[PDB]
Design a protein around this ligand. Structure first.
Ligand SMILES: CC(=O)N[C@@H]1[C@@H](O)[C@H](O[C@@H]2O[C@H](CO)[C@@H](O)[C@H](O)[C@H]2NC(C)=O)[C@@H](CO)O[C@H]1O
Ligand SMILES: CC(=O)N[C@@H]1[C@@H](O)[C@H](O[C@@H]2O[C@H](CO)[C@@H](O)[C@H](O)[C@H]2NC(C)=O)[C@@H](CO)O[C@H]1O
Ligand SMILES: [Mg+2]
Length: 369
């Protein structure tokens, strides 16, 4: 099994104990580390932070402590949008220019591959032709990587992609049978399945549907999403299950109505380190649990939730990570990916569960070390 761990280049700016840079990573936890994010300019891959070159070096220097580790650079992300991707894939010339820039950039800075994080082909302004042109881009990139390996006598660069977990986005975005032939791994974003945007409480990454859900609400679970990818053409061994090391928060409209599906208002509370309404890192969750919160096991969905007065949290813990890890092995998936290692209790100072408790749980369950 593989354990793919995302690192984010803005975690460095969090205050105090939240500040996280590549030297905070334990290099033996994961099989692959992915650096989020690179950008694009003039159809070529580029940096986005003033000190990315420094952080790239610290990141790829982690391979000096773990000889089996591979690193990848992710391009895109949510806030990147779709416009640069649409322009880049629109012509063979623009695609060859991008691919050429990627080979040079990855080799120069010491990366072993590229993770495509276009959110999403065919959605968010991307026109319908981008579904097929994404396949063309990946096929051409895979072919170019194969040839560069022969020419340079080095192991081939990997091409992977982070892909939608929402069914409407999947249907608009991906030619799954053909795309799956050329990708090395498919990182399915089986999280953000519920959140304050819905107006009621729900779990960030429930394994199974809630018993009362019918129709399109029943898409919103790990089991459905992973099996959608598998049964529409993706090989199980290339499919990587997304594991969030964070939870989504809500403000309850009536604190006495605090179950799954209880009505909510607004964007949800923010945490002192991540400072974004609706989102708490696992280490911030541990502080909440120590602040008088009630913890509940959502038995049908195999995940926890917790509440305190008007605040409600849907999240993941060691138990739910363990259940889902057993599940993915039983379904013959390729492994797990975590968003994001800088949201784990990397200092060990918040959760009393050791350093990197969630990532360590997957390391152990998947036999990585
Ligand atoms: C591989 C992956 O999950 N990519 C997406 C991420 O971009 C997104 O994280 C968000 O990234 C923004 C930049 O694109 C950051 O500004 C923001 O802080 C961060 N949000 C959260 C909730 O972490 C993750 C989140 O699951 O999912 C994808 O959408
Ligand atoms: C299954 C699905 O498609 N869920 C969607 C959510 O992803 C989305 O939330 C946003 O997800 C981004 C990663 O893809 C994050 O970067 C972003 O922070 C997050 N928005 C939040 C937390 O408010 C929601 C709302 O846009 O839509 C769902 O359909
Ligand atoms: Mg009640």
């Amino acid at each position: 099994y593989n354990l793919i761990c995302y690192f984010t280049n803005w975690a460095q700016y969090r205050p105090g104990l939240g500040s996280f840079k590549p030297d905070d990573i334990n290099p033996c936890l994961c099989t692959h580390l992915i650096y989020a994010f690179a950008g694009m300019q003039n159809n070529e891959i580029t940096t986005i932070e003033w000190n990315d070159v420094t952080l790239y070096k610290a990141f790829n220097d982690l391979k000096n402590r773990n000889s089996k580790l591979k690193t990848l650079l992710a391009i895109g992300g949510w806030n990147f949008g779709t416009a640069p991707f649409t322009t880049m894939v629109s012509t063979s010339q623009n695609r060859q220019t991008f691919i050429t820039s990627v080979i040079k950039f990855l080799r120069q800075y010491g990366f072993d591959g590229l993770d495509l994080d276009w959110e999403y082909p065919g959605s968010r302004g991307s026109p319908p032709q981008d579904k097929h042109l994404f396949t063309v881009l990946v096929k051409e990139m895979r072919e170019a990587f194969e040839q560069e390996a022969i020419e340079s006598n080095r192991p081939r660069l990997m091409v992977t992609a982070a892909v939608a977990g929402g069914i409407s986005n999947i249907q608009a975005g991906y030619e799954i049978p053909e795309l799956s032939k050329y990708l090395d791994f498919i990182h399915v974003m089986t999280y953000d399945l519920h959140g304050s945007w819905e107006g009621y409480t729900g779990e960030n990454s429930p394994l199974y549907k809630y018993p009362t859900e019918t129709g399109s609400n029943a898409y919103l679970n790990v089991d459905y999403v992973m099996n959608y990818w598998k049964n529409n053409g993706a090989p199980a061994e290339k499919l990587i299950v997304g594991f969030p090391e964070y939870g989504h928060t809500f403000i309850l409209r009536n604190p006495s109505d605090n179950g799954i599906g209880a009505p909510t208002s607004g964007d949800g509370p923010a945490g002192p380190y991540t400072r974004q309404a609706g989102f708490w890192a696992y280490y911030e969750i541990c502080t909440f649990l120590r602040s008088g919160a009630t913890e509940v096991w959502d038995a049908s969905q195999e995940v926890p939730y917790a509440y305190k007065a008007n605040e409600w949290l849907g999240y993941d813990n060691i138990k739910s990570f363990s259940v889902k890890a057993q599940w993915l092995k039983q379904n013959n998936f390729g492994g797990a990916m975590i968003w994001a290692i800088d949201l784990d209790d990397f200092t060990g100072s918040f959760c009393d569960q050791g350093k990197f408790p969630l990532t360590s749980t997957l390391n152990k369950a998947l036999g990585i070390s």
